[PDB]
Symmetry: C4
Subunit: 484 residues, 4 copies
């Protein structure tokens, strides 16, 4: 029905279009846009364009493998099975040429998709149409028909024309790039992994085509007596032995492992071998470049923690700190960050208000809810107070607060054992989940006791400056703080 | 005419000189400077120096290819066509040597271009003059004339002198570097692409010269019976077969693919082969280094977004957040940044006032102009207010504001559907282009209703602290805000 | 005893578990957790799992070397020593398969270790159980027994089944990764060094297995007359010559150095050679990628200082500063940073209060304790004051303070000689450990004398704004400052 | 004299010691320290240790080349010239072993150089003494003397002992590293260039030693009939042909180019060839890693500007800005930064007060000195005011200030033409060196005219907030500002 026919050719409401246009009402504006651009236009982000390009990619990967083998290793392509393959492929590649006059273009400025038929047509003619045309039509068969109005020169010149089909590769590169840009904003892709697998496919294809070229240049010269096919005495072999040898010869040149059975002798074999070496050595260097970029993407977190740490070593070196002070700093960094590099202030600033209060409640509510000052309070005050907590780590034997020093912060133990000490009492231990320093909120001057970390304390602190800032916004709580 | 003759030798008012000197009046000071430095001086940034160096680069690329072939593969260069090529080239390379006593130098400190003839002369003598001189004059022809006041020793010793012309390569490297520094501040060049194409040109040239060297060392020894030219029986071949073989042999050594037809036998072939291997393996490692640097420049935006994200995963890992909270944070980052890394505060701080207000009007005027508070206002207040808007994203089911909580911000929907809810009414939906929270500007205390995101809201917020700051500068608006 | 039997299978209080769970009381909760999860469960972080996996890694590294040699180069494995090795190994690899139904899993979200037997079982079946099962059981021996209810086809088909044991490699990769994640949060490992040594082990193993494959494919074809083993006439050699040749042939293909004695002739040797070339060239590119990442980790501090410096050169270039001003800036950066890159404000903000006061006392107490203003003060004021000192460097001939200019800072000499000058006196020199500018704290307006650096002064400064801020917190000191 | 003898062995006052210890009085403390540590001690940073290590590096580079050639390619070393070379070298390497009991050690924590003879002795025994001892003494000659109390077994076993001298390489690596750490804090070295040249030296040496090993293993087996020396029929050749071949064979294996004349045949040649391939392929991958790191250090400024720019493109893409707005932003970035990346606020914060005022006077004094408000003022006010100027760039057609808008900044033209426009007058142009907006300092409310950039203005601005801040510190100027 025409409802499904026009539904297929407009950008459907899905994961990708919602993220590209911003809302279902933005998608439904772009739909209305194409539904009024002209008759039977195709949006680049349509399901029809997806499924067509998926058929094209399966056609192209098949033709670019089979075509140079069929031209090189078989005596003629005028038999029925080869006529059927080449006519069936060429009509599909000609439908694709026609649909490119119907399909809108994504703009480099992300502006409103080009959908006027006169601009979609005019931009294709100024770009890919000539390369897409001469690789779509059966140029070898129309030339052969024009010749019907010696045979072994025509049967050889048509092989060179028959390879104009290899320019389909330009559509393969273009249509792969367009669907990778779409799957990137859909499926959470590592860019270096995607670029590695595209290059491996291209390298295997170049090796395959060089393999055909190694035999094709001898074939077009009628296998002269100084070429590798004559020297290895394999002109009369089956197509599968000839192909396997030619592929082995190409792969040997391109990996720079050797020449095949012997070094070249004829001028054609010299220059085809040197071409293969230069192309293969260039392609291997690009592969090593991609492998290096993939490997650097894979331990970036560890690299970055080591760069951070090595700047801490530079600081201690510049100040000439003693070896036991350096070990104490190193030991603090390992307990405080646990090998992880992140910047908490940047990460929390990038979030929204719902995500920040959800993270803060997960970290801190199980600590602060147990304290009698907060067990009485309204949740919208508690969430505001928990956002002022600062995480601190202390090593064994550190004084967290000293008796007689001025109080400025309270502390809540997440982990580790502390101990409070005074001349008037025993050394009372405090453990994971407890709190201390609380009196500093509601006083001035001296702390009454010393608190010292017995194990590695992990703890949250609240300062008087922040506790007062969070009570300027809650006057109904300040009266209870002065009365409990 | 002398108007065009002196116009050619001074820095013309163009794209490059305007950006280098800062203004047309700065260019016209430098012009007056050269027009009074001495007779017929050449500014380094002149059109004459550009067109001369363009002639030199075409001469050098031609001579450095043709000269070692002519010396190596032809019996003598005393015939008329070779005398014409070598005399015509040497006079052009001698005019270039003379013009370098007339051409000012760019200083490493970017100070006023060196234009005193005594400093331009004295700096050239302390640097490149000796290498430029011995590669400019026909040292082989003056030596041959001095010999006219056995032949097969002189015809061989002159070949070694004739290769002093290869030091022209130093001018090719120098003049390429000078025009790349100029085209960089003209044409928006990726540095790694430029350095890749310079290296490919150098590698092809080194392979070509090694190809000549493979045959030249046998030739100067009169093709001894243990060398590759005698072993392969090609001493009597045409120059094109000998060159092709010698190039194939050099390229085989330098790509480390093999030796040619067989491993070396003579001491000359051993040491020339080992030299070729060391040079070629070094050059291939430098090529792989450049390919790696090019490939890292090409997906830098994706690499940087992945490094940023992997630090967000480290934060969630350190805090041991639940898997559904991690999925909610991951899902927020994908909607909030759409795979793009940038720092908006740094980018807006680097711009000028015209560009910031032009960007802010594009983003926000279509939202805020629809609101009755601002539809009455003067544009110079609206632009000041739009600069205080902050972009925020909310996920489905997030409460943007809760009933009874204290109001501090207003919101404008760019995209997505929100819904306002209360016991006194139905769930009124709000869509792309609407606004809510407006009462918070002109009150204190509780919000009257709950607003919850139904889809992913993309929205702009304005806080009361910023709305008050933007009204301290506009007292004529504060009276209308208290009265409308 | 059952105390040690259950003690072995629960996460022991040690360096790693203390850092993973956070405290001894957190470890003792996880212990109680496993001690009540079911009968005889194994925690992934146990000493039993460590020692078992250490036995497995020694078994796997031995079997994956010995098995493909025994299958390839020995006539049959039905003799007693091979039956003993294969049965003894297979029972150990079957105990390991059983213990994986008893061992808890580390979750990707770091949530509470999976310890319910029904989830530990169900997750193993959905993952590695099928690969671990078919590589644990003696599939070749049960098939051979099933055949007892022509011999040279069965003795060859069982060799292919006997290589199902190579899938043990999946356990080797898995168990190596699990213990590297544990040793990373234990022993301060450079990530690129660890990944280099894992890859070298894998490359040697792949070369060893390709070496067996080079001979195995001929062997299964009964050494046809066109294969390398027949061509090199070594079918009857000892196992050690055959292995050495086959390894040399594999290593030649994989390093792309050559084919062995000659290029391939048969279709099996062609395709096995091409497989070996593609695998080896891929593996070498991954090795070059890891070597590059290791080398970038090793001079990161130097790279980063050079990037920092090159941006200082860009600043001076943009402003077109004179060459002597650039030399003065370069000379300042070398004395001020001594080739070291660090950000002191970030490093001090990441520390705790004990570490900051410990570093500040090491740097500054030996200077400020000698001054009469501070020799009278309480240590808890001195430590607060020392934290406000700012490090400054001056070059020879710089005026640190000028007579008649307004005073705002005091200075303490760490290193270098300064000199104070006036019309009323001689040029009094001041040396390492002295102080000057002191009057500015207790006055207003003009400095009474000029101080100029004679050598490179390294000195600490205290500003009046900070000295006043550190006295708002100490009113008992402000009275002495007004009276001494 | 003893004054020069003790002067040589203590750290001299020079470029390096001044930067390492901080001041001449710090050097003179370390001198006094060594002058009282014990009899005849050597400081690691002495001139004597420099000149001794320079003699050692020339000895080591010579012995490590000559020794394996002399052992491998000459019939015996019992003749007088070889006895003289080996005895003269071994006594020098034994003096070096003795001086290491007299030389202090640099500590990894940069603490006071280890100078107690009992710690200098005890630390050497726990480290390098055993390797330095067995490579210092003539182990082959004392063994030969012990044998005097069949000859062709002893003459061969002594060759293996004679190669214990190759462990001198450990001193070469150690002493190179120590002098590179010293020259780094002396001479402004690119780290990747230094590491490249160390690796090239090591690669050439490994190739040279593998070249000796290729012939030595045949020699110790008495040239068996299946080895390359017998197969190539060169057992009776001169030492220079044998060396050249052996080097070519090693270099062929290590660059993976081929085997030499043919593939290996004997078990010794197989395993020595495979060892050479693995070592050479590893070393080439490390070389490619260093080349890649060097190449990334060389265009770091360009890479970093491109990464910065590509984040500006991501911002414009995220906001979907129009193509002409993107071109206007791109055009602004090119005029505002001129392809240069630097952070001016970080660079100025790292400088001292003398360098900041020296840079500010170079940029801005030639502008602001021409204005009548400042031509009357004291220089110590002008320098304070110039530090508040902010650099701004405007494009053609931008309004810098609009008539009737509120004034907040004044402007000084560095470059470009502006024009002031009003209904009451002609369009007055203003050029490089002029100023405008001046009235805003001494008023409130509306600007009287519009100023629009006609070309690209580069200009400095001063805001009223900063002009008032710079007058709070200068009350004697505020009266003139209210009266002129
Ligand atoms: C062109 C072809 C022979 C090729 C070159 C470079 C690298 C590879 C793979 C092995 C990664 C490859 O297949
Ligand atoms: C010197 C010459 C043979 C050469 C060496 C390295 C790399 C290349 C190209 C193929 C990139 C090259 O042509
Ligand atoms: C597969 C095998 C032959 C191999 C390939 C790549 C690199 C190496 C080592 C020398 C690093 C290696 O042993
Ligand atoms: C060991 C030796 C043959 C070697 C290996 C790797 C690289 C080089 C140079 C050419 C950089 C080299 O000389």
């Amino acid at each position: 029905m025409q409802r499904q026919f026009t539904s297929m050719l407009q950008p459907g409401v899905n994961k990708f279009s919602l993220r590209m246009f911003g809302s279902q009402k933005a998608v439904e504006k772009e739909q209305e846009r194409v539904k009024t651009a002209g008759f039977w236009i195709i949006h680049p982000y349509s399901d029809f364009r997806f499924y067509w390009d998926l058929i094209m990619l399966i056609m192209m990967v098949g033709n670019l493998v089979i075509i140079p083998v069929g031209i090189t290793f078989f005596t003629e392509q005028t038999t029925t099975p080869w006529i059927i393959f080449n006519v069936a492929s060429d009509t599909v590649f000609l439908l694709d040429l026609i649909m490119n006059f119907r399909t809108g273009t994504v703009n480099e400025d992300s502006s409103e998709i080009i959908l006027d038929p006169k601009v979609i047509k005019m931009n294709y003619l100024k770009s890919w149409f000539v390369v897409d045309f001469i690789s779509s039509i059966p140029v070898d068969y129309i030339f052969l028909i024009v010749e019907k109005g010696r045979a072994l020169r025509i049967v050889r010149f048509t092989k060179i024309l028959s390879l104009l089909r290899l320019l389909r590769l330009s559509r393969l590169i273009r249509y792969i790039h367009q669907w990778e840009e779409i799957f990137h904003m859909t499926y959470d892709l590592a860019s270096a992994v995607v670029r590695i697998f595209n290059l491996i496919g291209m390298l295997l294809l170049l090796c395959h085509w060089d393999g055909c070229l190694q035999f094709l240049v001898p074939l077009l010269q009628d296998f002269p007596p100084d070429c590798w096919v004559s020297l290895n005495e394999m002109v009369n072999d089956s197509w599968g032995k000839q192909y396997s040898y030619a592929l082995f010869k190409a792969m040997s040149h391109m990996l720079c492992i050797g020449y095949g059975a012997q070094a070249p002798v004829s001028m054609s074999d010299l220059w085809i071998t040197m071409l293969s070496m230069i192309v293969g050595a260039t392609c291997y260097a690009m592969f090593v470049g991609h492998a290096t970029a993939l490997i650097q993407s894979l331990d970036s977190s560890r690299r970055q923690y080591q760069e951070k740490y090595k700047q801490v070593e530079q600081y201690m070196s510049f100040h000439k700190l003693p070896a036991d002070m350096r070990q104490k700093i190193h030991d603090y960094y390992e307990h405080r960050y646990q090998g992880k590099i992140f910047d908490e202030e940047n990460i929390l600033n990038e979030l929204n208000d719902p995500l920040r209060e959800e993270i803060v409640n997960f970290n801190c509510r199980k600590l602060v809810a147990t304290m009698p000052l907060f067990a009485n309070a309204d949740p919208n005050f508690v969430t505001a107070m928990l956002s002022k907590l600062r995480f601190e780590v202390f090593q064994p034997g550190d004084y967290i607060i000293r008796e007689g020093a001025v109080g400025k912060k309270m502390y809540f133990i997440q982990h580790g054992v502390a101990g409070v000490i005074t001349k008037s009492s025993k050394e009372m231990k405090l453990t994971d989940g407890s709190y201390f320093g609380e009196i500093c909120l509601l006083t001035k001057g001296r702390r009454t006791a010393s608190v010292r970390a017995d194990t590695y304390c992990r703890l949250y602190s609240l300062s008087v400056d922040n506790f007062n800032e969070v009570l300027e916004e809650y006057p109904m709580m300040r009266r209870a703080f002065e009365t409990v």
